[PDB]
Amino acid sequence: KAIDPYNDNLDFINQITSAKRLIGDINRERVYQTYTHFSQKPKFAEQVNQLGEEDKYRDEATYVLQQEQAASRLTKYGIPKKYIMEQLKA
């Protein structure tokens, strides 16, 4: 809930980019035994390519890799009402 990609404030964003330049990089797979939307999980994906070959997994793996390999606020998370109405005044 907290990480809203459509959130656009200097506070919420400068706290992010300033973190990575100082921290470096993270392997967040140790952290999350459940699923997240914002995280990168290559080892998670390299699996599903192999399981994806079977019959069950083609119809279901596609939505996963669409959800991962995508790069957009828009196509991935849709477009909520607020982000549009901001652009009429702008």
Binding site: A45, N49, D59, Y63, S72
Partner: protein
């Protein structure tokens, strides 16, 4: 050979995908331009259409034979597989297509919409 190659540059920017399509679109606009009253106009189209129906048959390549996919009453034709990857030039490691390459960034499609989409493709195969 002098004025042929320029038409291919002109006709495309016009609707005419080929040279003869110009004639097919400008049949009647051009038929009025010729006078050889109404019987001359009616006989003028026959002077034109018979040319068209002769110009084609020479340009018409002998079509390949009838495939399985064509004229299938119950189902449409097959949709060729589109992929995002280019195989190695030599496959020492035998690479294969995978689910990631079928996907395209910057285009998405709802979860339910796919399973509907994929079933009716599975029924074709």
């Amino acid at each position: 050979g002098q004025f042929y190659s320029t038409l291919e540059v002109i006709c495309r920017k016009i609707g005419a995908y080929n040279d003869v399509e110009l004639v097919k679109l400008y049949q009647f606009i051009l038929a009025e331009k010729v006078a050889d009253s109404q019987e001359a106009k009616n006989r003028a189209i026959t002077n034109i259409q018979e040319k068209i129906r002769f110009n084609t048959n020479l340009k018409r390549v002998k079509q390949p034979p009838r495939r399985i996919d064509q004229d299938d009453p119950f189902f449409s034709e097959e949709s060729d597989s589109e992929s995002n990857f280019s195989e190695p030039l030599f496959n020492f490691e035998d690479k294969k297509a995978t689910v990631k390459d079928l996907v395209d960034p910057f285009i998405t499609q709802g979860r339910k919409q796919l399973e509907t989409q994929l079933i009716w493709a599975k029924v074709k195969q």
